[PDB]
Design an enzyme around this catalytic site. Sequence first.
Site, PDB file in Angstrom:
ATOM      1  N   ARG B  78       0.862  -1.182   0.000  1.00 36.20           N
ATOM      2  CA  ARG B  78       0.000   0.000   0.000  1.00 36.20           C
ATOM      3  C   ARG B  78       0.898   1.232   0.000  1.00 36.20           C
ATOM      4  NH1 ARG B  78      -3.622   2.374   4.932  1.00 36.20           N
ATOM      5  NH2 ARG B  78      -4.245   4.295   3.837  1.00 36.20           N
ATOM      6  N   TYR B  89       2.534  12.195   2.217  1.00 37.37           N
ATOM      7  CA  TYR B  89       2.111  12.803   3.491  1.00 37.37           C
ATOM      8  C   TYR B  89       2.726  14.181   3.638  1.00 37.37           C
ATOM      9  CZ  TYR B  89       0.046   8.472   5.356  1.00 37.37           C
ATOM     10  OH  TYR B  89      -0.747   7.378   5.585  1.00 37.37           O
ATOM     11  N   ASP B 115     -10.740   3.537  15.763  1.00 38.26           N
ATOM     12  CA  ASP B 115     -10.146   2.829  14.643  1.00 38.26           C
ATOM     13  C   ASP B 115      -9.180   1.702  15.050  1.00 38.26           C
ATOM     14  OD1 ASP B 115      -7.752   4.183  15.247  1.00 38.26           O
ATOM     15  OD2 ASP B 115      -7.367   4.791  13.202  1.00 38.26           O
ATOM     16  N   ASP B 152     -10.724   8.784  14.784  1.00 42.74           N
ATOM     17  CA  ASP B 152      -9.332   8.726  14.383  1.00 42.74           C
ATOM     18  C   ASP B 152      -8.688  10.117  14.594  1.00 42.74           C
ATOM     19  OD1 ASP B 152      -6.899   7.865  13.260  1.00 42.74           O
ATOM     20  OD2 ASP B 152      -7.572   8.109  11.206  1.00 42.74           O
TER      21      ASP B 152
HETATM   22 MG   LIG Z   1      -5.636   6.075  13.194  1.00 44.65          MG
END
Ligand SMILES: [Mg+2]
Lengths: 277, 282
Positions: B78, B89, B115, B152
């Site tokens: 991934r 990012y 999460d 999250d």
């Molecule tokens: Mg997270």
Amino acid sequence: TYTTRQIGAKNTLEYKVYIEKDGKPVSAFHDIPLYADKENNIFNMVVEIPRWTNAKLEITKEETLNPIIQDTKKGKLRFVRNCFPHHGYIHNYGAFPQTWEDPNVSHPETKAVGDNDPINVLEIGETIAYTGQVKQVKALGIMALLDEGETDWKVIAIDINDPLAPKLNDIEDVEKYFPGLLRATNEWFRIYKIPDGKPENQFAFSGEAKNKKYALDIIKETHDSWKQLIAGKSSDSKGIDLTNVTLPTYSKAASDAIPPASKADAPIDKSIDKWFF
Amino acid sequence: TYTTRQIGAKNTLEYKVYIEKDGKPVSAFHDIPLYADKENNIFNMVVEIPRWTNAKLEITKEETLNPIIQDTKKGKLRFVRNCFPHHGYIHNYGAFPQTWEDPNVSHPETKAVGDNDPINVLEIGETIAYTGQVKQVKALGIMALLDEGETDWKVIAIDINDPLAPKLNDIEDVEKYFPGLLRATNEWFRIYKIPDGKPENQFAFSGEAKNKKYALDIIKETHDSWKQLIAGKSSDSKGIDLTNVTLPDTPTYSKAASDAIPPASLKADAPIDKSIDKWFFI
Ligand SMILES: [Mg+2]
Ligand SMILES: [Mg+2]
Ligand SMILES: [Mg+2]
């Protein structure tokens, strides 16, 4: 067939990349034909700087066969700084060989002399390029940058191998498939030298990207500026090295005189990571 | 002192990074203290992903001593995709150890379960971090992301060694010295999986970055969930490996799990498929 020959470690003063045709160094300025297919206006682009890097690599005017080296100021390697929200250069960046922004005459579109370099090209495709790459591109349009007050056209182009190339034929298609990129391009070239302590740059035509026909005219004009140059028909050739090997300053010996290939990338000072707001 | 032990080549299925103390693996999830300096609220951040990279490296909950391993989707490596105007990012990205977004309760602020991971941390300082780095950070604020419908939270933090750290004390200071960054961060977490064929994410509080005081309260909550988890008292620990080498009062303490880890076998970064270069215009 075009390949590259690297001398030294990247990110050092000794680094040079020569372009080779069939294993033999040629001039990256004068010896790569501008047109790969003239009839269809497919150009050869010399890639200097891959997207999302900082090292200010470029075809050098004053060395024999015009290898790509890192720009310096007063002995210090130049790295373009990260300007939020951008990471290094936001295009594959380079130039068309066999062109010149003539520094001896005022360009009527911008009221300024040229910056003395091959005309610059912003290649907008998906794939990140490599320094010294000769790729084939189609021109989509053009922007008129006054770079510290000198005419510094930026051609907007795409690799003919890009998945989207068949759908991209004019400047309007850039707005379709890459919304925001033209704005980002305007912003980038305005501010990228502010972290160095230089002024904001400006664009003619309010930053407008002119269409493809306009771009082909400008490119052909710089290619003629180049033919006067290489003919030695210059009021002022500004110390450029005019040596070549496939074509007066012709010099077939030049290609054997290039040293042989060499090193892993040298480290870049951590200061180059910094994001400027 | 914290170091890394890398097994294999980066950008491969075999790649693992364990965090070491005194040259021996410890659990990156359980054994690195949440606080570097409790009295001054200085935290240990475990860095997973350096700024401007793509490989989705993360602490592995289900693996002994929780080494960082590249996430996979249906078995393939991934990589987070580039979403214009961003490159990979846009923060040094990772987590606080000794925290857990409890998946077994509905969190009141978001009306959603957690999460199931350590609370995430966005570190905003100038220097690009490295995977497996333990750095010391100050918390500045927090955002309430709903990541595919799950709570999250993202802590906004800065390396205490950053030149600007003394000037950054609360969330308003981020806007002052990093203008546009919080807005971009909101965008990034909304859109980053759209190229994966997932829906746009959402934030509670209309994306507001809550302040340091709020952040500290949420970090405490996630630390408490973890204290329950590690003691063996969670209603459902989700198959998480709780093996640790520093917490004697836990049922899963085992100093010798460290000896069982293979030696470093660091190889050069493997090539990444050119598809990952692509800039997605959303
Ligand atoms: Mg997270
Ligand atoms: Mg220059
Ligand atoms: Mg130029």
